[PDB]
From Swiss-Prot:
Induction of the gene: Directly regulated by p53/TP53. Negatively regulated by miR-126.
Gene Ontology biological process terms in this record: DNA damage response, signal transduction by p53 class mediator; G1/S transition of mitotic cell cycle; long-term synaptic depression; long-term synaptic potentiation; memory; mitotic spindle organization; negative regulation of angiogenesis; negative regulation of apoptotic process
Keywords: ATP-binding, Cell projection, Cytoplasm, Cytoskeleton, Kinase, Nucleotide-binding, Phosphoprotein, Repeat, Serine/threonine-protein kinase, Transferase, Tumor suppressor
Protein name in the entry: Serine/threonine-protein kinase PLK2
Phosphothreonine modifications at: T169
UniProt-annotated location(s): Cytoplasm, Cytoskeleton, Microtubule organizing center, Centrosome, Centriole; Cell projection, Dendrite
One of the record's GO cellular component terms: spindle pole
Keyword Transferase: yes
Tissue expression: Expressed at higher level in the fetal lung, kidney, spleen and heart.
Function: Tumor suppressor serine/threonine-protein kinase involved in synaptic plasticity, centriole duplication and G1/S phase transition. Polo-like kinases act by binding and phosphorylating proteins that are already phosphorylated on a specific motif recognized by the POLO box domains. Phosphorylates CPAP, NPM1, RAPGEF2, RASGRF1, SNCA, SIPA1L1 and SYNGAP1.
Length: 285
């Protein structure tokens, strides 16, 4: 199917479906003017009929479009016709880390380092743009043909605010809600670091440190930041996790601290992972 941008000319060719993404049906989409393929979100206007959800995609577009970094999903272009909103993004042929961990259950430490360094790289970039991601999770770590990680899904992203004028209600339904968010202090950069500690824990253990049902029954355990630290963890992994999941947001490490922690500097890390790592445990050393 040929899709024309009524604003510019510009013709696109719709390829195979990639599946559902919230408000969107997702497709391969080729810009016929470079002949390059992008991952497209196609959202019918009927899915954004309410002003609040109209405002939701608009902000996603506004924030995402200004980002350029090797470990952030590259926004290409967006347009609309009478039927749909089209958001064309960097095509990542090897799905996400959610798909990888589902298959692998648990990852090796050099792999955890490989992926985490890339997540930290992209999040660093965001935090310096004073943009908070607000839903860091394995499904939002997209993996391209070359096994490179890109942080995506800016659905819940917002510009940083000072505490005094900050939103205090839980925004959307993120994977890892953060003691300070549950204490109605709002979501800061440390809340992204929370979610990064939960990610690392999940990569190593195959399950989150706290329940992720977002039910009010789980709030106390999260606020208290009490969890099982399994003995299977190596000591440096244990220490870095512990620091990222500090109860008090002020006690958590900076991003520069995180990648300079012993967990990273005292282990081997590949420059490149093979795609077999999506399915199979890699060889030693
Ligand atoms: C287009 C949405 C999401 C995505 O954001 N990117 C960048 C992506 C990039 N490459 C492949 N798929 C991607 N997806 C998938 C499509 C179905 C569910 C999520």
């Amino acid at each position: 199917r040929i899709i024309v941008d009524p604003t510019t000319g510009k013709r696109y060719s719709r390829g195979k479906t990639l599946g559902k993404g919230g408000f969107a049906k997702c497709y391969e989409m080729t810009d016929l003017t470079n002949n390059k393929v992008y991952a497209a979100k196609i959202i019918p206007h009927s899915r954004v009929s309410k002003p609040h959800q109209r405002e939701k995609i608009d902000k996603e577009i506004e924030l995402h479009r200004i980002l350029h970094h090797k470990h952030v999903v590259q926004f290409y272009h967006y347009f609309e016709d009478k039927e749909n909103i089209y958001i064309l993004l960097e095509y990542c042929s090897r799905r996400s880390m959610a798909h990888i961990l589902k298959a692998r259950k648990v990852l090796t430490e050099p792999e955890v380092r490989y992926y985490l360094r890339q997540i930290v790289s992209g999040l660093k970039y965001l935090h310096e743009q004073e943009i908070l991601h607000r839903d860091l999770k394995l499904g939002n770590f997209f993996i391209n043909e070359s096994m490179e990680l890109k942080v995506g899904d800016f659905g819940l992203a917002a510009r940083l605010e000072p505490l005094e004028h900050r939103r205090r209600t839980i925004c959307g339904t993120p994977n890892y809600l953060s003691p300070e968010v549950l204490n109605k202090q709002g979501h800061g950069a440390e809340s992204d670091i929370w979610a990064l500690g939960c990610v690392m824990y999940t990569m190593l253990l195959g399950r989150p440190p706290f329940e992720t049902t977002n039910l009010k029954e789980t709030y106390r355990s999260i606020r208290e930041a009490r969890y099982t630290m399994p003995s299977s963890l190596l000591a440096p992994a244990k220490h870095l996790i512990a620091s990222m999941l500090s109860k008090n947001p002020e006690d958590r490490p900076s991003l520069d601290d995180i990648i300079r922690h012993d967990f990273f500097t005292q282990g081997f890390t590949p420059d490149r992972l093979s795609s077999s790592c999506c399915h199979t445990v890699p060889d030693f050393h």
